[PDB]
Amino acid sequence: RECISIHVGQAGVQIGNACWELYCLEHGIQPDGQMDDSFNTFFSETGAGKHVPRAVFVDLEPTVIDEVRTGTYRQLFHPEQLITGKEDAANNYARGHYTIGKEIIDLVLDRIRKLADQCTGLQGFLVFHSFGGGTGSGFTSLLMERLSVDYGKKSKLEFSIYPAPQVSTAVVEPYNSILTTHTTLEHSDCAFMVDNEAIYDICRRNLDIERPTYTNLNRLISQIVSSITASLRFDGALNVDLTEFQTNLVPYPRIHFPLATYAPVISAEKAYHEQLTVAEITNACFEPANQMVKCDPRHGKYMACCLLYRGDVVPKDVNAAIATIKTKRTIQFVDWCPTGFKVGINYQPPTVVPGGDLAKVQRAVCMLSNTTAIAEAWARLDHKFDLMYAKRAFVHWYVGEGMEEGEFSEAREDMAALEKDYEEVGA
Amino acid sequence: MREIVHIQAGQCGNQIGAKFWEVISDEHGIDPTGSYHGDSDLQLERINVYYNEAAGNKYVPRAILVDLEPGTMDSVRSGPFGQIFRPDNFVFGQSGAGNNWAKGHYTEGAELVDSVLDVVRKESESCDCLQGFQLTHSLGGGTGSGMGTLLISKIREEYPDRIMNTFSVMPSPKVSDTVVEPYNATLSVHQLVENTDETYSIDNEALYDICFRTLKLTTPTYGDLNHLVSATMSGVTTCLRFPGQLNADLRKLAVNMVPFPRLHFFMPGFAPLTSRGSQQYRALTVPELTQQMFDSKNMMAACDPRHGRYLTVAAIFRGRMSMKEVDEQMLNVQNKNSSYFVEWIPNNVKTAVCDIPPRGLKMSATFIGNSTAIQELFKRISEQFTAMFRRKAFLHWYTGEGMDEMEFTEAESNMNDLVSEYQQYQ
Amino acid sequence: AECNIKVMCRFRPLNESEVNRGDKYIAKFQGEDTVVIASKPYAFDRVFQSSTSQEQVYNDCAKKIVKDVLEGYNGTIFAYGQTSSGKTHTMEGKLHDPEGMGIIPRIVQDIFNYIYSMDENLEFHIKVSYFEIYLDKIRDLLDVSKTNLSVHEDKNRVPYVKGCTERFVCSPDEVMDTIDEGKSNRHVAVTNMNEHSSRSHSIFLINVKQENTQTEQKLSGKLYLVDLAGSAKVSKTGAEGAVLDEAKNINKSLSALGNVISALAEGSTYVPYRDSKMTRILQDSLGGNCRTTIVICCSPSSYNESETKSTLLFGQRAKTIKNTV
Ligand SMILES: Nc1nc2c(ncn2[C@@H]2O[C@H](COP(=O)(O)CP(=O)(O)OP(=O)(O)O)[C@@H](O)[C@H]2O)c(=O)[nH]1
Ligand SMILES: Nc1nc2c(ncn2[C@@H]2O[C@H](COP(=O)(O)OP(=O)(O)OP(=O)(O)O)[C@@H](O)[C@H]2O)c(=O)[nH]1
Ligand SMILES: Nc1ncnc2c1ncn2[C@@H]1O[C@H](COP(=O)(O)OP(=O)(O)OP(=O)(O)O)[C@@H](O)[C@H]1O
């Protein structure tokens, strides 16, 4: 029972650097590389008294790889695993997918293949990236296409960062997203999306961080992606493996776009004053402003929901919690799945980083929910894409790489088909 | 790893380039001789991007200086950081251009281009992977406007895939220190618009207005203006020079800033800029920095941005700061001034950040803007060129080097096409 | 004073690479004016089927264009479409075969026949040039020494090329020999989608000057025959290496042409011909005193249906444009 966690782009490598410290603190692994089965999923055992993680950080520019090498987690990671390119993607899907990718995918595929051959209990892969930029779109699509053609049946967990409605970091983000999603629709088994302004607001209103940073944003994301696999890592009363996220949450082979959220989020002084029980966290996770994506769930319906709890929590109280949540009529479930709840529990409680913003909580829950609220976000993305497409804005960079307007039109009509499928299944 | 080739042409070009080398050497902690005495390992981590390693722990810059008189070379060699430059790179002729584009592009340019081409080829071969060619020149005068344009054309022919970046100073009607300056500008813009990928348009009167308004200096010389432009020249190149939470190289900012190949004439800016006596009475927080970035008077161009509309802008910050504050500041900036941003783009703003600010400042930023307001500065130079050209004034010197009036007519048509292109998207 | 730019559409037979894969012939013809693809009508001036011969296509396309360009106006004939659409087979064809020869030798033969039929008093002077685009540089195919050419504005600010070997011709045999030499000097590459893939836009210009000794009347005409490359899909082609660098220039040129066409269709103020030199050369063609003709080639296979639709709607945008003739 293992799974390999690969990272692409500045967002991916920063999330990896922010999360592997949490993993090593959870498993008791010091940064030097030394202190039975709990760490076997993400860390190997190299000879005697030494570990190495099952991960690769790949990026075209070297500005992230050299600082990762010269940081503080130097002796923990393999020196050769940190793959570095030679040229900048420059927020260009075509440049990240075609010119610069082709000279390093030959090494990357061989490296993942040889490090997977020694493994035997690999359940799947999880890829960290961001379609809002160039590297995390182009190189991710390039690798996932030739990984799906080779393995195919093995599971792939996509973790992407998407732009806010009113805020955007780049200017070619809708072009990058609409281009890469045309390939992500068929090869990605399931893809969790995160919005920047939602995760800025979640630490503003609750955690009381007036001036947060990307490290503070990535800490709770690392907590989420560690809590989903905490069931595999540690024993539980009702364990859920990685195949549950494929089987239960993907009712159709192309409708595989769930939203994500977490609870409780609380500062140190507020933790001692607020009580921790299942009821308030269950009410807060379904709260619309508490989600990690700026979408209104009230406008749509929940197609499916998997609750994963951590800490000393009995089954009875969570059963009562989901019962009263079902009787609550503020939310609305679709008629095609009345039994739309999948509850699971792990005994190992959440951990806290020394000096981190998060506080010690006796119990926690992560809520990945499949719903139709993302249809509005996709329609918004297509609407803002069409305004620039009509004027042919930022098209000369793409066509000067090797592409044309044909695959732009195919991306547009594929997004239209996605909207058609979502409005059809939401009826 | 992503090395940069530096080339300097003309009097003002080599002056601002020397100041750029001085300030970045001070930031990296490089002695005037060439030895390293820095405190942070990050300075040495990316010293190879500009400086070549030499014996005795010495570092020599990858700089090319080319001038059509020995006086500029003597001055920059006698400057504070003149000895650090390579003696081999001091290529120069004997006779000056005399403020003639034709002499710089045909007669002496042809004689010196073969001398500089192998030198830039050797410097390109020395590094592992050239990223782009950064150049500094002046549309005014003959030397820069001819020789830098010819050098750009030959390097574009030799490397049609690499980035071509230029920090070009251009004239103004209120301050014009040359009689042949509209002619030189009209001839040089025809070559700049077709060959160069990126272009930062700088105006002297804009820097003078800056030094009057916010610096409040009593005796502003060219040294202050060199330090002013060197700040933005370092701000654009900080992303590849140091790590950052959201890095944006030259190609990364170019892809966001260049929506079409011709509309690549930017409007650089930098802040904070304040007097030494008024530093205590200012809060350096990011909202008061961001308002100064988008202030109309703070830009380094004489054009009024409120009279036009921004095609796209980019803000590269330096120093530890909150990404939420940067995001919400850019949000309210693009929202409250929606009339001054084009509606046919959802987000006209790019953001980047570096984690190591300049010495002596805790936070800083640079603004790079492409807007329709540059059409004013283009059309005033265009009509100034036309008024002199319509009676064939100041052309008997140009005809001596085999230059024809059809070339001037083609340049005028190119200027008309460029200003109409900028007027189309307004 | 005002004349619509004439648009023609052609569908070709299915190729060996398409029939063996099992591509369906989705092209459906409803008369000559309109063509239907998946219940989507598209109206043009004349639609040609797979069975239409080279002579039939030439007589329908460029028969009266010879009269128009000889009268005093300008003529520009050029092709558009995707890869493996048949642009080379339409325009170049088989030079040795009288039946399989394309449009360009037939045009020269018609010009010479008209000159022979016309009386001897009207003196003619024909001069040809042949060049192409590679690495964003204009290569003159008639001389190997030159690697880049410049485009300069004439007296009335019409752009045209300079420095090319303007070969003054008198008989058709030397014209055909020069065309064969240019074709031999043309660079071609082998790909999965096409063997003799034309990886560059080839321009063939014929300046015909004429003067009447009796009336002392002079007339000049620039005849452009431009065979453009097809928009190559990277997934379908499997392009890697120098073919990618060729595709960069090809896609830049066709994207600039499409931007010009969209600007002219929507009625933009500036009409950016300056996006590329390939767009600058056709300034007089698209917005001058020229009676332009454009042919779009479409593959009837279901595999290339998306780019077929893109070419059809591109022709629809191009049809509404009017020139200032
Ligand atoms: N901001 C600065 N501007 C300068 C400086 N020196 C000159 N200039 C301005 O640039 C204008 C023309 O630039 P140059 O001095 O380089 C004339 P150039 O050397 O290219 O030709 P020749 O000297 O005739 O060989 C000039 O009229 C000034 O307005 C300077 O040191 N700093
Ligand atoms: N939430 C979050 N998003 C991030 C973080 N870092 C980067 N991003 C997002 O990533 C997007 C761009 O991704 P990339 O393509 O990898 O950008 P890059 O690494 O600089 O690549 P180049 O500019 O081409 O060199 C930006 O728009 C950001 O919104 C982060 O730390 N947290
Ligand atoms: N209309 C047609 N009728 C018969 N055969 C054709 C036709 N079009 C193409 N072919 C066949 O296809 C072969 C190659 O096609 P061709 O070179 O014309 O393609 P193309 O689409 O013009 O190419 P490119 O995109 O490289 O310019 C020709 O030799 C001929 O065998």
Numbering used by the authors:
A (entry chain H): 2 to 36, 52 to 443
B (entry chain W): 1 to 426
C (entry chain l): 5 to 329
Manuscript excerpt for this entry:
Microtubules are cytoskeletal filaments that play various important roles in cellular processes, including intracellular transport, cell division, and establishment of cell polarity. They are highly dynamic tubular polymers assembled from α/β-tubulin heterodimers, which are arranged in a head-to-tail manner to form protofilaments, with ~13 protofilaments associating laterally to form a hollow polar tube. In vertebrates, both α- and β-tubulins have multiple isotypes encoded by different genes, which are intrinsic factors in regulating microtubule functions. The GTP bound to β-tubulin at the E-site (exchangeable) is hydrolysed within the microtubule assembly proceeding via longitudinal contacts with α-tubulin, while the GTP bound to α-tubulin at the N-site (non-exchangeable) plays a structural role and is never hydrolysed. We determined the cryo-EM maps of α1A/β2A, α1C/β2A, and α4A/β2A microtubules in the dominantly populated 14-protofilament type at the resolution range of 4.2 Å to 4.4 Å.
Recently, we reported that α1A/β2A and α1C/β2A form microtubules displaying distinct properties, which was mainly mediated by the C-terminal tail of α-tubulin. Previous studies have suggested that some tubulin isotypes have a distinct influence on the dynamic properties of microtubules; for instance, microtubules composed of α1B/(β1+β4B) possess a faster growth rate and lower catastrophe frequency, α/β3 microtubules display a higher catastrophe frequency than α/β2B microtubules, and α1C/β2A microtubules exhibit a faster growth rate and higher catastrophe frequency than α1A/β2A microtubules. The microtubules were decorated with K 349(E236A) to aid in the identification of α- and β-tubulins in the reconstruction process through the “seam-search” protocol. We then built the corresponding atomic model for each of the maps, including the non-seam region and the seam region. Similar analysis of the lateral interaction between α-β and β-α contacts in the seam region suggested that the α1C/β2A microtubules display a subtle longitudinally contracted divergence between α1C and α1A in the seam region; the α4A/β2A microtubules also display a slight longitudinal contraction (Cα atom RMSD of ~1 Å) between α4A and α1A in the seam region. Taken together, our data suggest that these α-tubulin isotypes do not show obvious lateral effects on their microtubule structures, while α1C/β2A and α4A/β2A microtubules exhibit slight longitudinal contraction between the interdimers in the seam region. In the present study, we assembled α1A/β2A and α1C/β2A microtubules, determined their cryo-EM structures, and found that they displayed similar structural features. However, the tubulin C-terminal tails that extend from the microtubule surface were unresolved, most likely due to their flexibility. This feature, to some extent, confirmed our previous conclusion that the distinct dynamics of α1A/β2A and α1C/β2A microtubules is mainly determined by their C-terminal tails.
